[PDB]
Amino acid sequence: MNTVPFTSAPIEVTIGIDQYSFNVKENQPFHGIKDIPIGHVHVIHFQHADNSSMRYGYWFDCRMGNFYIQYDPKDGLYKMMEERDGAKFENIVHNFKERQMMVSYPKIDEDDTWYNLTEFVQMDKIRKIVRKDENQFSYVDSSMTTVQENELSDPAHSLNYTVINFKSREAIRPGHEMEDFLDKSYYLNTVMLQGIFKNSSNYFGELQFAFLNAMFFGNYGSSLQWHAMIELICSSATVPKHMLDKLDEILYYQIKTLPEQYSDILLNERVWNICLYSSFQKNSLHNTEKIMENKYPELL
Amino acid sequence: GAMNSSNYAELFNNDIKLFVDDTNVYRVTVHKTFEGNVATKAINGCIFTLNPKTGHLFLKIIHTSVWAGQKRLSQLAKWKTAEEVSALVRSLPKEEQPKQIIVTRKAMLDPLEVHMLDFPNIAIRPTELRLPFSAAMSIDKLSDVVMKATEPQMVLFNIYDDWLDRISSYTAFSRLTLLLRALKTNEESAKMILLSDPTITIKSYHLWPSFTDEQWITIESQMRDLILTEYGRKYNV
Numbered sequence: 122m123n124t125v126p127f128t129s130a131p132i133e134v135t136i137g138i139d140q141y142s143f144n145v146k147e148n149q150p151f152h153g154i155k156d157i158p159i160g161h162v163h164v165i166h167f168q169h170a171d172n173s174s175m176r177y178g179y180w181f182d183c184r185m186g187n188f189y190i191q192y193d194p195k196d197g198l199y200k201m202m203e204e205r206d207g208a209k210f211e212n213i214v215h216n217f218k219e220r221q222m223m224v225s226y227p228k229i230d231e232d233d234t235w236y237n238l239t240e241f242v243q244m245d246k247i248r249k250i251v252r253k254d255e256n257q258f259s260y261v262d263s264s265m266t267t268v269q270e271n272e273l274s275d276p277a278h279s280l281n282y283t284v285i286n287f288k289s290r291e292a293i294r295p296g297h298e299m300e301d302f303l304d305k306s307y308y309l310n311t312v313m314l315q316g317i318f319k320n321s322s323n324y325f326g327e328l329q330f331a332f333l334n335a336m337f338f339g340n341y342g343s344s345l346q347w348h349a350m351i352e353l354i355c356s357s358a359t360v361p362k363h364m365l366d367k368l369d370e371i372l373y374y375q376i377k378t379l380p381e382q383y384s385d386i387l388l389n390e391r392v393w394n395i396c397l398y399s400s401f402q403k404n405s406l407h408n409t410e411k412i413m414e415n416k417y418p419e420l421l
Numbered sequence: 422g423a424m425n426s427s428n429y430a431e432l433f434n435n436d437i438k439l440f441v442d443d444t445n446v447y448r449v450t451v452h453k454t455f456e457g458n459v460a461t462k463a464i465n466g467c468i469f470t471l472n473p474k475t476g477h478l479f480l481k482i483i484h485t486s487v488w489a490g491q492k493r494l495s496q497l498a499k500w501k502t503a504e505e506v507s508a509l510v511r512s513l514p515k516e517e518q519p520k521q522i523i524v525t526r527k528a529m530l531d532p533l534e535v536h537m538l539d540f541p542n543i544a545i546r547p548t549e550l551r552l553p554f555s556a557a558m559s560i561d562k563l564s565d566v567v568m569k570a571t572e573p574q575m576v577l578f579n580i581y582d583d584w585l586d587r588i589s590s591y592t593a594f595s596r597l598t599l600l601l602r603a604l605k606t607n608e609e610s611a612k613m614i615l616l617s618d619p620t621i622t623i624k625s626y627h628l629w630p631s632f633t634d635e636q637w638i639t640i641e642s643q644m645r646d647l648i649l650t651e652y653g654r655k656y657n658v
């Protein structure tokens with residue numbers, strides 16, 4: 122069980138760690154988060170009390186290094202930083218653990234929510250969507266735009282999700298215009314799965330990462346990407362059986378975890394109605410359809 | 422974006438454009454079977470592709486064999502339309518290719534956009550105008566060549582005959598849409614107005630009668646009266 126310790130907490134802030142969150146007061150003696158489960162990526166995220174503009178945060182994996190959070194009063198945010206001296210880190214942390222100045226990652230033993238939301242998410246893939254190679258962790262915020270959004274303006278600060286566009290030469294084989302537009306199987310299976318992602322695990326990982334950025338940061342381009350990746354599967358008549366079953370589990374946990382009050386902005390009515398009621402796969406997402414109907418029957 | 426009453430003069434500027442109407446592509450007669458069920462029989466159709474500035478009509482005849490063994494024909498018809506319009510554009514020299522294509526029915530937007538991916542600089546636009554191009558099959562020479570076709574065929578016409586020698590494109594298009602609106606609202610009465618006089622003939626190389634300027638005023642007035650009448654005969658006014 123690993124630890125993301127904090128220099129201090131000079132400004133009042135709501136801190137998230139994965140699906141959990143707690144409020145820290147200005148200059149409250151807070152020195153970080155312990156008992157973080159090894160084996161998963163994690164995200165530590167922030168919303169300042171004085172300016173709810175810009176939720177921001179850091180994706181990290183404690184197996185890749187020793188990380189700490191420190192407030193920068195010049196740039197005005199909590200920054201993740203890696204400690205290269207392992208003794209100094211163990212020593213600063215143990216002192217912080219002995220003074221009980223750390224909150225405990227509050228995982229219920231029965232609870233597989235975080236695993237289910239991050240099953241296919243790998244740090245190495247995050248670091249290719251979010252390019253900042255000198256760090257082992259990845260900064261995301263509410264305002265960052267995606268490669269695709271920019272094509273339609275600072276490239277170093279972009280989310281490099283795989284571009285999906287149903288009316289593009291990439292999606293439509295010359296001579297198969299109607300076929301490929303109405304059945305997206307060749308775009309899913311040949312172009313995307315075999316060609317770009319290499320396997321369904323990487324595809325699901327990007328879909329899951331896009332959802333988590335939409336949920337935790339209100340990142341609009343991430344929500345667009347999440348819906349596009351769902352729609353591409355549902356709009357394909359030919360999808361491996363293992364992918365449909367896994368997709369149903371993935372979406373079920375995403376819908377389960379979504380704040381009830383954010384459904385108006387994080388869920389696209391058209392995509393969901395098409396996917397659950399009109400698409401080729403309208404009958405292949407039983408768990409997702411059941412939770413959506415019982416939790417958001419208005420949207421539908 | 423969409424073409425409407427506010428940007429109507431754009432139709433007659435010097436940027437090449439084409440209207441595409443797919444109404445008459447997939448045509449059927451509905452009938453009873455021996456067992457008393459209902460079935461359709463397709464008849465030949467056409468794509469109506471018209472340059473409103475010059476009057477040049479690219480009438481692509483859709484022969485019933487294109488539907489043989491196909492499903493969901495009304496959906497296929499939109500895609501076949503877009504395939505043929507794209508084929509037409511590719512067949513034209515670059516300097517004759519349109520800058521815009523305006524579809525009369527919004528359901529043609531996605532099929533045409535997808536077939537025109539190779540032409541990203543050709544704008545595909547809908548229109549809010551309710552144009553009467555479905556009535557093209559009320560023009561006797563057009564109906565005749567469509568019904569007589571035994572194979573797919575493209576036939577070229579000028580839908581304005583020689584009118585542009587005497588009037589502007591704007592006025593020619595206004596006359597065409599009045600004639601077609603009349604034919605759509607009351608075909609029998611419209612044809613009587615046009616063709617009741619056998620002394621006023623249609624040139625071999627024309628579609629409409631050779632009316633003098635003053636006879637066109639009389640004709641145009643008779644067509645308006647017909648449309649207004651039908652509007653009353655309809656709603657009772």
Ligand SMILES: N#Cc1c(O)c2ccccc2[nH]c1=O
Nearest residue numbers: 126127128189191204210213
């Ligand atoms: N300044 C400073 C530092 C810290 O506050 C710190 C706190 C937690 C972990 C490692 C740390 N390293 C530092 O360099």
